[PDB]
Design a protein around this ligand. Sequence first.
Ligand SMILES: Cc1cc2nc3c(=O)[nH]c(=O)nc-3n(C[C@H](O)[C@H](O)[C@H](O)COP(=O)(O)O)c2cc1C
Ligand SMILES: Cc1cc2nc3c(=O)[nH]c(=O)nc-3n(C[C@H](O)[C@H](O)[C@H](O)COP(=O)(O)O)c2cc1C
Lengths: 184, 185
Amino acid sequence: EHIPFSHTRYPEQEMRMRSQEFYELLNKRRSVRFISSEHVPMEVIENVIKAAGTAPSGAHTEPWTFVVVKDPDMKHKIREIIEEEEEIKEYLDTAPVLILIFKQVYNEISVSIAAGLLLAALQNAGLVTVTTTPLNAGPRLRVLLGRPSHEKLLVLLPVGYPSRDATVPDLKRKALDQIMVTVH
Amino acid sequence: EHIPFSHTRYPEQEMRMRSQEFYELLNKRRSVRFISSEHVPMEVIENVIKAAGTAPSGAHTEPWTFVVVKDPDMKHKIREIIEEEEEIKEYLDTAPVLILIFKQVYNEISVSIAAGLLLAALQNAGLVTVTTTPLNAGPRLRVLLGRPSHEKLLVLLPVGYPSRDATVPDLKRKALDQIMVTVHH
Ligand SMILES: Cc1cc2nc3c(=O)[nH]c(=O)nc-3n(C[C@H](O)[C@H](O)[C@H](O)COP(=O)(O)O)c2cc1C
Ligand SMILES: Cc1cc2nc3c(=O)[nH]c(=O)nc-3n(C[C@H](O)[C@H](O)[C@H](O)COP(=O)(O)O)c2cc1C
């Protein structure tokens, strides 16, 4: 039931270096809302989901379902509902792949952490997306997509290469001194 | 306001390879509840937090605060409250560093995603932890730690090297076919 645990320990210098570079890698990440229609490899899609599946989960429930949508039609019907639920865009059609993460009713925290791992894994693999969380369209998408009662939509990520013409907003990230407080 | 966006595109082969290896790296991760007292570099601690700070955030609120506790005393007082809130362990003392992530009142999803990035970054840097989320001790820790009204505790992660004697439970992860469903037709 409890086995010894096998670690890979790096010399402090390399721990600094590995952590620096990883930071450098992720900081290049930006939500991209202009996504090419260009095929992306299914092996990479699978790999990032495998990555996301390595998340910790409250009580080890591993309560996540990763729904991969590729059918152009399905993607459009998804687009329609989302847009409909206001009620007071294009990437959902142009992206090659939709990944919707449903949680299986702490679960929400696990799943979202899993989404975090998913995001890192795309960045690390040369793909972009724009995280979104249309919880108001959740129900109708549960039904459209055939998901069972016990799944509720959490995150919807359109995945692909950026458009040759893509742009992002000129936004700056908080510096470290603005997000980290040390107790002495 | 809107600048062109600069991408690094890898040839498909390398995208496969990079994504495989990253998967291999993260899959080595396991919550470890036996943590050595051995100093860990502050530069690595800072780096993983910087990484966690790169998360996406609803409306770009970036609403996370990363409280680093190192004082042995402070860590103990934190331990006491947590244990007290049942009311029907040791790693919080033995770990060199506590990282508590508070959210600043979608925020909860952003922050948790950020925690995900934090977890990857520790794994990637040779450190372990055991994710936990003592929301019942949140209030008393807000006060103990001096955090302001608008912060609520979310995640508490004790960080360190595993114990020379550490063990984990023999748990298997769902295979891909168990967490991934493809829509065709
Ligand atoms: C939201 C959340 C809360 C958790 N709370 C605790 C906890 O209170 N105590 C604990 O030992 N582990 C806690 N964990 C860790 C899980 O028990 C651990 O991730 C699970 O056993 C899966 O094991 P693994 O992380 O090695 O894959 C929590 C994990 C998550 C995602
Ligand atoms: C929980 C969550 C929900 C989000 N929802 C949307 C959304 O509905 N539309 C959108 O364009 N971006 C959405 N985003 C992306 C954020 O707007 C984006 O991350 C933020 O502008 C920061 O920019 P960056 O990711 O490039 O750092 C969401 C992000 C998070 C974390």
